[PDB]
Structures are given as C-alpha cells and as structure tokens.
C-alpha cells in the first residue's frame, strides 16, 4: 500500500503534445540519467546463478540505458569469491549508472571497497531498524562518516516503512545526496510506517530542491508517474523485472523495460508534461489516508492541486 492510489492527476483536455516531444531524462543528484526508472537487483542465493542473473540485468540495463542497483555487497566484501558476481555488472555495463549497496552497519572503509568493487556512480545505504530488531545506535554516525569519505553520491534507502521529513532532514544534513523511499512481535508493526506517497509529499515540503527516489510497490507506469509528480526524481523497480528475466531472459526483460518507459511517455503526453520537471509540477489531488496524514503533519495538500 504505497498510498499512490490516493493521488489523482487533474485531467488535461488540451495537452498540446506529441509523444515524440516527451523528454523523460532526469537527475539523481548531480548524476544524469536518461531514464526515471532504474532496476533494483536482488541479492539472491549467491553462487553462479546470482552471477548470471546480474550479468543479464547489467546487459539489459546497458541496452535500455537505465540505471541499475546491485544487491547488498556486504557478503562479497568478506568473501573474495562472491565478489565476481558484482564486478561482472560493471564489465557488462561500462557506460551505465550503477549503484553500490551496503547496510547502515557498513563502515567508511567497506563503503569505499563496495563502490570500488563495481565502479559505482553512487552508493546506496539501506536502513531497517524494525526488521533488524525482530530478527541500533550509531546508524546516523556511520552514514555521516561514509558520506564524507566516498568519492560518489550516497543514497540512503528506507526499506518498507517510509520516511519522515525529520528523518530526511538528518540524512540530507549528514551528507546524503538523496533518499530512497520504500514505504511473535511482528504484529506490532502491522499498521506501522508512512506510505510512499505521504513520505514524498512530506519530505518535499521541507526540502523542495532535494533529490528524492521512490522504489517498491510501483506496480506500473502510472505509479511511477504519481511518485515523480509527488517529487521523486527517479523511481526503482525490482520484482517486476526479476520475473520477466526468469521468463524470457535478457530479450524479455529488455522488452518489459522499453514497454514501461514508453507507457510513461504516454501518460506524460496525456498530461501535457513535456519533461520530468514538468511532471513534477503536474496538478493533482491527494485524498484519503494520505491527505489526512499530510494535513495533520502540517503539509499543504491544495498546493498540489492549484499549481
């Protein structure tokens, strides 16, 4: 439940645009991407299978010209053996944006080694206190240390429970180039968190010019569009691509990518949005739970409509 169904674009009768004029390029921090959609690979079970799955993703990605994030490289950090499974990603995709990945427990050292491992353009640090607690002092400290010692932009990612404007503000201040929103005691967290939608609207209100990313739960192109309209500069997808891979291999995956990138252009065309920056100012109406949450949190919702 990303809360994106609480967002409805305001219809444009005269979009005055041709699909061919639609520009979907975007900027993740200072990095330039020709796609507002990137692939979030899964760690997997390791071995030679993970290697082939990653190689395929990298090829597909390289061809579609869209970014690619690898799974956690922590294990490959201690086991020189498993390291090949990630280096193959940079070998297959030499000119594409690729993001490294490590948990918030990582040290500035490991972060550098992970980035160097695949020649990353950015480094993703994922947080997950609620999950690590069931199965946390120093997290922010560690992130702050990593940010000032890596040669690339850092993207702090929250897996599942969303992020507040306070959390985002701390990461930003600490040095994070961006944030990636993914929003017998497990019951305690059944209705816990902030929705992807609410998160974006919240963080956007306090930091208008700050890079936001949304990933997880984005079922289709309309989802991507809503997230980007709420402020996201880029969106990420995993499962969707993973399965298309195991069904039709590289050939299939590539198709699915192109298909959704074209389906986004279609939505932008119907909205009169010529570029991603235009899609970020598209009039829309927030309703339901999201609208309630934002209202109580002090976030203005009508500004999304009257703009």
Ligand X SMILES: Cc1cc2nc3c(=O)[nH]c(=O)nc-3n(C[C@H](O)[C@H](O)[C@H](O)COP(=O)(O)O)c2cc1C
Contact partner, 182, from ligand X, a second copy, none, Cβ < 5-8 Å per class: ligand X
Residue ranges of the binding site for substrate: 131
- Alpha-carbon distances of 92 from 45, 59, 125, 279, rounded to whole Å: 21, 6, 24, 32
Among 215, 269, 290, 301, binds ligand X (CB under 6 A): 215
Task: Rule CB under 6 A: choose which of 159, 222, 270, 285 binds ligand X.
Answer: 159
- Which residue in 229, 180, 231 sits closest to 205, CA to CA? 231
Interface segment toward ligand X; rule CB under 6 A; list 25-33, 170-178, 233-241, 265-273: 233-241
Interface mask toward ligand X for 40-69; x: CB under 6 A? x-xxx-------------------------
Of these partners, ligand X, a second copy, none, which one is at the site of residue 216 (CB under 5 to 8 Å by kind)? ligand X
Q: Which residues are annotated as a binding site?
A: 41-43, 72, 101, 131-132, 157, 216-217, 238-239
Say which entry of ligand X, a second copy, none residue 248 contacts (CB below 5 to 8 A, set by partner kind).
a second copy
The sign of the CA dihedral 203, 205, 211, 212 is positive
- Measured from the CB of residue 233, what is the shortest distance to a second copy in angstroms? 19
Site for a second copy in 233-262 (CB under 8 A): 242, 245-252
Residue 52 DSSP one-character state = H
Does 84 engage in binding with ligand X (CB under 6 A)? no
Per-residue contact track with ligand X, 107 to 136, x per CB under 6 A? -----------------x-x----------
How many residues bind a second copy, per CB under 8 A?
88
Out of 2, 26, 40, 50, the only residue in the binding site for a second copy (CB under 8 A) is 50
Sign of CA dihedral 212, 67, 244, 262: positive
Q: Beta-strand (E) ranges in the chain?
A: 7-9, 26-28, 31-33, 37-40, 68-69, 98-103, 122-127, 154-158, 178-181, 212-215, 234-237, 284-286
Two structure tokens written together for 156: 């702090």
Q: Bridge partners of 28? A: 31
Does 193 interact with a second copy (rule: CB under 8 A)? Answer: yes
* Among 73, 123, 66, residue whose Cα is nearest residue 96: 66
Quick check: helix, strand or coil at residue 103? strand
169 binds, among a second copy, ligand X, none (CB under 5 to 8 A by kind): none
What single-letter DSSP state applies at residue 23?
B
Site for a second copy in 164-183 (CB under 8 A): 164, 166-167, 170-171, 183
Tell me the CB-side half-sphere exposure of residue 102, using CA atoms within 13 A: 31
């Amino acid at each position: 439940e990303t809360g994106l169904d609480d967002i409805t674009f305001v219809h444009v009768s005269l979009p005055d645009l041709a699909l061919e004029q639609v520009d979907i390029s975007t900027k993740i921090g200072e990095l330039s991407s020709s796609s507002p959609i990137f692939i979030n690979a899964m760690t997997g079970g390791g071995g030679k299978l993970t290697y082939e799955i990653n190689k395929s993703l990298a090829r597909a990605a390289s061809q579609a010209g869209i970014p690619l994030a690898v799974g956690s490289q922590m294990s490959a950090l201690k086991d020189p053996s498993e390291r090949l499974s990630y280096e193959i990603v940079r070998k297959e995709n030499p000119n594409g944006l690729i993001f490294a990945n490590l948990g918030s427990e990582a040290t500035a050292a490991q972060a550098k080694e992970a980035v160097e491992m695949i020649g990353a353009n950015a480094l993703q640090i994922h947080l997950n206190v609620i999950q690590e607690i069931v199965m946390f002092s120093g997290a922010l400290k560690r992130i702050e240390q990593i940010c000032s010692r890596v040669s690339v932009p850092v993207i702090v990612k929250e897996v599942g429970f969303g992020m507040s404007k306070a959390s985002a503000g701390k990461l930003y201040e600490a040095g994070a180039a961006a944030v990636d929103i993914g929003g017998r005691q497990i019951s305690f967290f059944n209705s816990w968190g902030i929705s992807t939608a609410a998160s974006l609207a919240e963080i956007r209100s306090e930091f208008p010019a700050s890079t936001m990313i949304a990933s997880g739960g984005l079922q289709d192109a309309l989802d991507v569009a809503k997230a980007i309209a709420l402020g996201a500069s880029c969106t990420g997808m995993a499962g969707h691509f993973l399965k298309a891979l195991t069904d039709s291999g590289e050939e299939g995956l590539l198709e699915e990518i192109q298909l959704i990138l074209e389906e986004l252009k279609l939505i932008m065309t119907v909205l009169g949005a010529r570029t991603i920056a235009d899609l970020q100012k598209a009039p829309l109406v927030i309703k339901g739970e999201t609208h309630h949450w934002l209202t109580e949190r002090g976030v203005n919702t009508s500004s999304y409509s009257v703009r």
